[PDB]
């Protein structure tokens, strides 16, 4: 895959378990709603407690629906018909 990156890089974040953008996401999300993939970073008005040293690894694409939900998506039919790698949109579509 050929994906651009912002000029601001987080070497420590990349070295720490190579977390894939944002926070430690995946399947171990047992909260109060399914919309926690962006609330935890868009709540604002406070700079957290624990770390207070890493807001976004790649703000060019990790802010709201900017690149991951607008490049190919996978629900617009025509936009999702491009010949790309099949197991690559699983990290962008919450599904059910």
């Amino acid at each position: 895959e050929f994906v651009a990156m912002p000029v601001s890089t987080d070497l420590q974040y990349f070295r720490t378990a190579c977390n894939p953008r944002g926070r430690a996401s995946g399947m171990l999300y047992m909260g109060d709603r399914d919309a926690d993939i962006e609330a935890i970073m868009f709540d604002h008005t406070q700079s957290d407690v624990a770390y207070t040293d890493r807001a976004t690894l790649n703000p060019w694409a990790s802010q709201k629906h900017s690149y991951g939900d607008r490049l190919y998506n996978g629900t617009y039919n025509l936009t999702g018909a491009s010949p790309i790698y099949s197991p690559c949109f699983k990290f962008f579509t919450p599904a059910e």
Partner: protein, 96 residues
């Protein structure tokens, strides 16, 4: 061949579920648990990889302890019939 296909339904994360059978949490914490479960999983998959037995030179001097540790299993709760017991008093455990 069909009788041999029970592995795909008889192979859950047993290796991963074995420690949780005796190290179940008993406190009240979610943030530290979320921050530490990723590290625990990555260390488990790093220490449970097959490279250790791939690069091992002496089996009984390298992987014997790990094989003995992972060979521990619990008996089933259903009592079977009288198995074929040896004349010297040797019992049958299982097949592999």
């Amino acid at each position: 061949d069909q009788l041999l296909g029970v592995l795909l339904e008889k192979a859950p994360p047993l290796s991963l579920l074995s420690p949780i059978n005796k190290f179940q949490p008993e406190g009240h914490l979610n943030r530290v648990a979320r921050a530490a479960l990723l590290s625990d999983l990555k260390r488990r998959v790093c220490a449970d990889m097959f490279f250790m037995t791939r690069h091992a030179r002496e089996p009984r001097l390298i992987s014997a302890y790990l094989s003995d540790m992972v060979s521990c299993t619990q008996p089933s709760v259903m009592v079977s019939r009288i198995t074929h017991t040896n004349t010297r008093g040797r019992q049958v455990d299982g097949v592999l």
